[PDB]
Each structure stands twice: as C-alpha cells, then as structure tokens.
Design a binder for this molecule. Structure first.
Ligand SMILES: [Cu+2]
Ligand SMILES: [Cu+2]
Lengths: 375, 106, 125, 375, 125, 106
C-alpha cells in the first residue's frame, strides 16, 4: 500500500463515521537513528530547502527553509538540528546577513536566530564537515575563507556569537572535545586548535600526505568516536583518530584494488564517503571514470573493514548517485542521493538492495545528515 | 581614506618599473620578499612573474577605514603603492588569502 | 494525459492531483511535505480562510465543500504540484478563485505559499 | 549560425589577433518595439525571475530578480520598466516588505526602491493588468485585496509612496489618463476612479454582463489607445474604449464560431488575450476543452477584426502554450510562452509560423510585457 | 553521454558545456543570460578574482589559463548550467578549486552566484 | 485591547443561541442585517445559514489597537461578540472583504 493510498483509506473512513476535519499544524515524530536530512544547495540558488525524512519508511516529516549555500548540522543525540545561513536585502543583492538558526527537533520552530558579525561565512559548495557542533552541543563552528582563515564560535546555549578564532591556512573543522577541533591544512598536515578560556593555541601535526595525494573535499567523520576517514582522488584512505591530545594516524588503506585501480576505478561524486561508527565500516562511492571527472556521479559503493582494509561488499546502486551516508543504528540504511533526479534512494546496508525512494527533493539535493543517537 | 596613493589603477609593464625601485616579486604562489621596509613617502612595486593572477589587498582599517584592493596582475606586470605614512601595513592576495606580506614604513 | 479533458476523480490516493478533494486545488498538496490531507507541516502556519469548491465524491456519490486553506511561512514545497479548476471563478468572485494566496489568518502573519490542505467544511448539497 | 557559434567564431578571431580579454559589465541595447519581458512566478516560489529578450532574434539581453509574486510593468515609450515586489526577513518568513523598483532600461540598475507602507500588495497569481502605470508614467497603481479593496499610488517622479485610494469591490486597474483608471467590479459593472487633487471620486458604469457571463482574469488592454478587450470563458468579448470621461462599450464579438463553440472550443490558459493596437486586431488563445479546464494550455490562437469581429486567421502553435501577447511594431511578432517547458516561442504574426524559441526561462514563465513605442 | 568519460573540447559553440574555455567552469555560462563569453550581464557585478585552470585549445594546440571570474548580485541564471573539473584541486588549494563562490572584488560587494565568464588571463604554457 | 468580549473562541450551535438575542444572519454572501444597533454591554450573535465559511473581523484600531478576527462559521453555526463600549464598529468577512456590516453601540 502506498502513502497516498493509506492516506485515502484513512480519510474515507473518518468520513464514513462522523469525524469532521479539524485542520491543525503537525509535529514531527521524535528524532530517531533513522531520520535523515537532505539539504539542497540547488546549484547556487539564492534560497534553498532541506527535507527531513523518516528513513525506515521514506516519508517526509517536514522541511526547512535556508538562504544562500547554507550549512546544516545535527546534534548527534537529537536534541536539535541547526544551520548557518545567508540572506540579502533584495533577493540576491544588498545588505548581507549571515546567521545561525537552531530548530526544535519536533516542532521545527526556530528556537534561536543568531546573527554572525560582518558576514563571515565561507560561501562555497557545501561539504559535510566544513562546519560542526562541539560534541557537548554548546557551540557551532564555521569557517571564514576571505579576508583570512578564521573559525567562528557560535554559542548555542547563550544564543549569541562568541568570537572569531584566527587559524592557519587550513580548511574543514573536526571537533574532538568541547574546546578542541582539527582542520586540514594547505601544508599537508592537520591543525589542532584549542580555543578554551578565551584564547586560541594552534598546533600542527606532521604531514601525512604529499602534494600528489589529493584529499577530496568530502571526508567522513564521527564526532562520537573521533574517527576521521579521508580519501584521495584514487581511493587511498588516510584515517586518524582525533582525541583532543592530538591526532593518531592509522596505516592508509587502499579502498580500491590494484586490479580495479588498473581499470580506471576511481571515487567520484559529492559526499562520497561514509563511516558507520558502531560497525567501523566504510562506504565509498566509486565508478570507472577519467581522472578529471571526480565530480560526476558514481553507480557503486564499496564497503570495507576500517581496521583491516579488507573489502566487505561492493553494492550496485542502479542509479547515477552523487552522495551517500548511512544511519548509525545497528541495522544501518545506506543513503544514496542523486542531485540529477532530485531523488533519494534507500538500501539495506547489509544486502545492498533498494528498499524505497523519495523524489522531488528540490533542484539538486547534495548533503545527507543524520543523528548518531542509537547507542 | 588613504595613507597610500595608487599611481595607476591598471597594472604596469614590468619594463616600465624604474630599475632602481623597491621590488616585491611574486612567484610560486608567494610574495618572494615577505617583509619589506621603506620610508614614509616612498613607493613599493609588486611584480608578478607567473601567469597565475595575483594582487595586493588590505582588510578594512589597515590602510584606512575602508578596505583596499589593488587590481590583478598576470605574468610580467606590476602594481605600485606609495605609502605616505609611518606604520606597519599587512596585506594579502584577494583570491589567495594564504598569501601575505607586509610593508613597514618609517 | 489530455490536459484539456474532463476531471475524473478518485478516492484511492490523496497524493494524486486527481484525488477527489483536490477538484479545485492550486499549488502543492500538504501531505507530500510533512502535513497531511487536512493538516499543515511542522513550522508552517495554518490559514483559517480560503477559496472553496463543491467537489464530488465517487465513493459516496455525495458532494462536499472543501476549504482550500493554505499552509504558509515557507517557500513553496515543490512536491506534488497540482492545479484543478472545477467551478473555479474569476477574481472579482474570490470565494471560488484559486490564483489567490489564501494565507489569511495564519499564525504570525505568514503570507507565503507552501502547500494547500483539503479539509471538508461539510456537505455542499 | 547559432548564438554560441557566432560567439565562438568571434572569440576565436580576437584570439588570432592580439585582442586580449578585458572583462566588463554590459549594457542592454536600447529599448525597441521588439523587446519582450518574461516574468516567472515560478509556481508561488518566494523569489522569482524575469527575462528581458530581443524578440527579433530571441537573444536574452539581461534579467531581473524579484520576490514573491511580483508584478511587472513597462512605460510604453521605453523610458524604463518597473515592478512591485515582496520580500521577507527570513526567506519566506518574518517581517514583510512590499516595495516598488524602477530599472534604467539599458543598465538594468535599480534607480528607485520605494517601500509600500503596511505590506499592501494583493498576493495573487499574476494577471497583466492587475497593476498599471499612469499614461504619463508618473505613478504606479497597484491593488490591495484584504482588509479592504484599495488602490495604492506610487509616485515614480518623486520616488515615494503617495497614498491609498479607497475603492469599491472591484479588481484590475486600467488607466485612461493621469488621474483616472477603471476597475472591473463584482456587481457586473466597471468603476471609474478619479484620484486627482488629493481626493478620490468613484463612479460606476452600467452593468455590461451577467453573473452567468464569466470575464476571465486575463483581459487585453492598450494604455495608448484606451481599448480594453475582455473575454468570458466562452470567448464572448466585451470591449470598451476608456477615455477619462467614461467607458464606451462596443457591441460584443463572439471570438469563436457557433460551429466551434458547438464542438467544445473554448479559450484556455493564462494570459490568453492579445490586442495589437496599431492594427486593431485581437489574438485569443483557444483549444477544445472541458468547460472547467480553463487554465490548461491551448494549442491555437485565433486572430480577428476588433471592429467587425470577423476572423482573420487561426494560427496553429505546435505546442502547449499558456500565454501570448504581440509586439506593437507594424510587423508584429506573436509571443507564445509555455510555463510547462519554460520556453518562449516566437512566430510571425502575419503568417503564424514559428521563427525561433528561447528556453530555460525559470520554473514556470507566465507574463509577457512589451513597450508600445513603435509609432 | 558518459558523464564519466574524458573531456573532449570544441571551439565552435561557446554555449555548450564542452566549449574549450569551460574546461573548469562551475555554474552557468554568462553568455546565456545577457553577458558574453568574457563579460557580465547588465545589473550584475564583475568579480576581479577567481579560480583558474589551464585549458587546451584544439584550434591552435596551445593552452591558456582562464580566470573563471563570477558575475554576482543576481540569483543563479538557471541557463546553460555546466560543470567541468580539468585539473580541479580540492579546497585547501583554492586557486584551482571550483565549488567556491568567486565573487571577490565585484562592485557593491555582490557575493551571490549568477554565472561565470571564461576570459583568458594569457598563455598557460 | 478589548472594547469587546468574546465568549467562546469556537463557533456555537445555532440551537444554543438564546432565542431572545440580537441575531445577524448570513446568507447569499451577505450579512442579512447590514447595520444593527445595541447598547453598551449587550451581545450580538452572528448566525451563518450556509456552508460557505464566513466570520466577523475588524481592521486594526476599530475594536482596539490590534486588529481582531473571529473564528470561521459553517452552516448553522454562530459566533458572539459583546460590545462593552459606546461607538460605531465597522466589520467585514476575512476572506470575503466585499462583505461588511456594522454594530452601533449606545
Ligand atoms: Cu595571489
Ligand atoms: Cu464571508
């Protein structure tokens, strides 16, 4: 039975009985490990939308309006979800305003609207971890690109803008503790920034890759466990377990086989990396492509052991997909989103089969977000 | 509005740079001479040795209340700024924020 | 298939433009974006006023007036877009005109179209 | 030769010679009787676009950004074009602002941004004459629906909001002179409003139609000649020549033949009425449809004498079209726009053949506007 | 046809995503909305800075660096959308990264993406 | 904030209307009794005789600084307002602006 069918039967009955129609404003079910968010940059449109979906059934719970290239985030425990957005006085022109909003998780009502001084948001195609919430959910950290590298601290508890932290030529943010997060730098290393007690102290780990080794823009990461998974255009994967004390790299795992890498296999798409925390498994979007077609869609997902580097499965999507992620529950779902058809595809992580799809999601849906609350 | 005085808006040819002037080259994505110091009233010339477009820029409040952005330079082009006041002026490349240098004026 | 052919109502899929209560809906069906056939999606605001239309129900042969109240405060859903004009009248006869943004009475003054609900106001007959 | 082809050849040559690329901001050619504007309500999107096109060639000259269901207008002599728009504090929610903008006709720069007190714009699907500019181009008149019928006067010369005129239960605005315009009322008549000298005096012509005779939302009209052409769902057409002194109705012309009306022919679409002033010809969009499918698209246009009511031609579009209009030059072009494919089709008014199309115009382009400056 | 197949440049249609100067364009082609291959459309603002890319020209066998400067101040054109990534680098290497909104230096601080122009900065070689 | 006092927010049943009260019927898209006049402290009941939803509404400043909007009524439902102050209160139907009436209170 379909959604619109179940709805019809439901209403036909209410009608058979007395049961009048008393129009009201809904509330979304409680947040669970199966809820997923689909932000939609819409190919650089001045305004955009994000859809909140129940993954177990593919039913839309509600939506959220955002401005220009906004960044979504979701407190792993489900206490809420937010976004950093940008609006203008006259649609796309005039006085700019960057701000952060925090939404009640069931009413979707904006419980906080915090303006960011001097429009400091890095206006850029959206990559999962370019912004992040401290693990204690008391702050939101975003990046500024011009005039100089900087990280803005947004106090979610006191609903206000803290300050800007000056950082090195590094990008992305990966929290590890209430006052420590790491960034990937131009110099080949990671930066460790401690912003505790009103001040910032920066450190640099050792270089863990060469100028020939291109880390993609879409690294996976788990705020809960600290695991960072970062590929290169070839599928080579540097991991690291961020702690606070510092980053402990692991032995690089080639996600693809020399036989595959031998036959043009390469990772491609948008959000191509997924790390299932509770299981320590990794999912990477890949297909056979030219070396300079790294943003095209892919039709396959490779799953492998994050500790051994041994392949567990190679799922065949059946569609041109651009982004993926998985639910953190014990029987994870595999999210496969296509900006080309604005359709989300949902598969059983274990079997790799498609269970259901949800279409008509904006103009070019690209970012998937979930809550890691299961365990 | 200006502790500096820009001679020309459009970049000049490397050749027209007076061969006796203070010159900050640019190559490999860097201002080859990071920190340079002159005297109030003098003129610094920037010369780009590669194709990669580059320029000189200042945030607001540095070279005055309003932020300043020189024009871009491609290979073998130059751009000049005369610093009319003693001070320490930090600068960067517009599209390339990871490129910085300074002009200490005395 | 033929946009110029007569309306053929059903009562088996509320998310199909030809569901019977949508005989005069303009916009998007709230059920496809978090609301329901008769309720608004979270975060949006419920208009109290609207254009109406007598719509025939094939299941009971009866006819009821539907109050096409809008859910406002959001950008148009973009999901399940539909447009039907059974007995739709021109603008100097608003009660049956559906190009109008029927957001009047929604909380906090929301006037932007998001989707439309199809509740029954009662029997038309 | 194609547009992008001509451009390529052009650049290939500049390259052969020295000719460096000195990126600059363009200016649109001067306004002419062949320029056309395509507003795009985009199916109730919170922001929208309008495209400015040279009809003689189908080349886009530039664009304009507008907010929520904005209304476009264009001074017949081409001295400029404007719009009445609506924005919000947070994309689609919060403090509302209704305003009017006037755009230089060649630089497209906003030379005036006049706020309308108390968000008085009638938020509604856009119909050509629901707003209008006085013939002397010194004011812009728009309609307020709730809390009560009213017409707002926007002073374009002094760039400010004049006042609201209280009017009867009437809709649409049709100027006939600097201080007089007419509206179609609920009571079956037209209202004549004179707003001169700081005050308003309302009058009502005689009823010119019955409650069974439905005047569509898309009447044609010529500010220059005063001719108003209004059909009914059946194609019956009541005209009237507005003067200032009052409206002088003409003998109704059936746009369709009893044989056609006998075979379900009926007018259908959005902006289905076109009146070519200099020629006194009328164009009406029509097809065979159910009586309650008056908003679906049509595949034909009928042309007829505005004085005799005698048919001159019946053009076959070749596409599902929703809106039409013509250029007022002596050898008019027939504009046929399809919101379904966001494509504008251009035909020779005299032969009815398609000359060129222009696609990718927003999400649902619906309104066509031109300048009546030719003669 | 094959989104995963190698770039095949042409120099016969500047409005086709495979025109040769677009080898690293992200967004929309300004020629399709009022501008030109090297100029911005009326009402929009010309950035002065941007991501570049060495692009091969089949007509002369040469290679030139293109400065993909954006035209800002408008909502995205929605016409002639394209995306190419020849030599495109990740974000910690901006000079070649094209997901960035290269509006820096445009008049009146316009930072919203409208379309991209493909002017030559000179010979790459 | 209120020269009026609304008894119930939700419309009442036509039957519960005290058969001795001031009654303004509504039908054929009109308030059947356009102008009605009462005394300060009395109560006017509005009764909708058709399916077409209708209500009573006031612009801002009429019944107080803030605008007021009664709930809607469908067939055989009523809505009541008690006017506590002498004055001339004009009103209209929310979705139907072409529907007006008044309540002169003395
Ligand atoms: Cu630089
Ligand atoms: Cu009413």
């Amino acid at each position: 039975q379909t959604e619109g069918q179940r709805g019809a039967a439901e209403a036909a009955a209410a009608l058979a009985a007395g049961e009048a129609d008393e129009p009201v404003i809904l509330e979304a079910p409680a947040p669970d490990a199966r809820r997923v968010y689909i932000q939609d940059p819409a190919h650089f449109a001045a305004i955009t939308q994000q859809f909140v979906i129940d993954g177990s059934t593919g039913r839309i719970l509600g939506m959220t309006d955002g401005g220009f290239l906004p960044h979504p985030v979701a407190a792993e425990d489900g206490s809420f979800f937010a976004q950093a957005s940008t609006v203008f006085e006259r649609i796309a022109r005039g006085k700019r305003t960057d701000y952060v909003e925090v939404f009640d998780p069931v009413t979707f009502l904006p419980i906080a609207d915090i303006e960011l001084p001097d429009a400091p948001r890095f206006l850029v195609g959206t990559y999962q971890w370019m912004n992040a919430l401290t693990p204690d959910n008391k702050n939101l950290l975003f990046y500024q690109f011009s005039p100089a590298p900087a990280v803005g601290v947004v106090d979610l508890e006191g609903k206000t803008f803290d300050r800007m932290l000056d950082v090195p030529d590094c990008y992305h943010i990966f929290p590890a503790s209430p006052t420590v997060f790491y960034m990937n730098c131009r110099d080949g290393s990671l930066a460790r920034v401690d912003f505790a007690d009103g001040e910032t102290k920066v450190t640099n780990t050792e270089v863990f890759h060469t100028e020939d080794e291109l880390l993609i823009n879409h690294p996976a990461f788990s705020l809960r466990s600290g695991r960072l998974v970062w590929p290169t255009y070839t599928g080579k994967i540097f991991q690291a377990d961020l702690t606070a004390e510092g980053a402990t790299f692991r032995a690089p795992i080639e996600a693809l086989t020399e036989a595959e890498r031998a036959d043009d296999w390469r990772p491609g798409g948008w959000q191509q990396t997924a790390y299932h925390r509770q299981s320590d498994r990794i999912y990477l979007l890949v297909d056979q492509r030219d070396e300079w077609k790294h943003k095209a869609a892919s039709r396959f997902v490779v799953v492998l052991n994050a500790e051994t580097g041994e392949r567990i499965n190679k799922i065949e999507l059946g569609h041109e997909i651009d982004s993926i992620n998985v639910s953190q529950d014990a029987e994870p779902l595999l999210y496969a989103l296509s900006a080309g058809t604005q359709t989300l595809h949902i598969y059983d992580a274990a079997t790799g089969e498609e269970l259901r799809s949800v279409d008509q999601l904006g103009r070019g849906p690209q970012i998937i977000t979930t809550h890691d609350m299961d365990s | 509005q200006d502790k500096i005085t820009v001679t020309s808006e459009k970049p000049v040819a490397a050749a027209d740079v007076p061969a006796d002037a203070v010159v900050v080259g640019i190559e490999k994505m860097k201002y080859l001479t990071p920190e340079v110091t002159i005297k109030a009233g003098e003129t610094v010339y920037w010369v780009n040795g590669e194709v990669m477009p580059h320029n000189v820029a200042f945030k607001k409040g540095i070279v005055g209340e309003d932020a300043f952005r020189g024009e871009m330079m491609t290979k073998d082009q130059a751009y000049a700024i005369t610093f009319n006041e003693a001070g320490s002026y930090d600068y960067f490349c517009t599209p390339h924020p990871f490129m910085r240098g300074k002009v200490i004026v005395e | 298939v033929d946009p110029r052919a007569k309306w053929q109502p059903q009562d088996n899929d509320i998310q199909a433009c030809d569901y019977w209560r949508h005989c005069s809906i303009d916009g998007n069906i709230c059920d496809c974006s978090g609301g329901s056939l008769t309720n608004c999606p979270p975060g949006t605001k419920l208009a109290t006023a609207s254009w109406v239309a007598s719509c025939y129900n094939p299941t009971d042969g009866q006819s009821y007036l539907i109050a096409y109240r809008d859910c406002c405060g959001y950008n148009v859903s973009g999901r399940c877009p539909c447009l039907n004009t059974e007995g739709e009248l021109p603008v100097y006869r608003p009660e049956f005109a559906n190009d109008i943004i029927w957001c009047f009475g929604a909380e906090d003054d929301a006037m932007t179209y998001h989707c439309t609900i199809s509740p029954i106001v009662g029997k038309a007959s």
